[PDB]
């Protein structure tokens, strides 16, 4: 199941933390609240951890961190596919 | 290159490393055809030849070389996923 996380869901992740809601997140990546929504709901399920809290941010989302050296490290693997 | 996902990753270092379809399936406990269909996708995303008929292109050898480093880094962050 965390075998299924994809590198959008991984970037949505990042940009709700960011930006602190799911409206905000959307008109940072240029995608639709539905989108991030959506998103966040799999990775929730993938990862059967709760990220978010209307009480909004999981003592587990502290996830942030440790996706921020990952997702260096998916952009530098685009770059060198890309110059095959 | 995509938002593409970890499961095609790991299905292409498979192939790399078992030299088969079916050995790569064997191995990570899919059916054969689902790895096929992922690595015919990874080779449109990457616009690649990745094999030939199934022994590896040159591209093919230089990813997997880029794809272990990414995969040390996916590993660390679904330990830590897990570990939540």
Do not use: C
């Amino acid at each position: 199941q965390s075998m299924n996380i994809n590198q959008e869901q991984l970037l949505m992740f990042q940009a709700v933390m960011e930006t602190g809601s799911f409206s905000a997140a959307a008109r940072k990546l240029g995608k639709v609240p539905s989108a991030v929504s959506m998103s966040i709901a799999n990775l929730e399920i993938d990862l059967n951890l709760t990220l978010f809290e209307k009480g909004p941010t999981a003592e587990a989302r502290v996830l942030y961190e440790k996706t921020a050296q990952l997702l260096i490290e998916m952009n530098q693997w685009k770059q060198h596919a890309h110059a095959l």
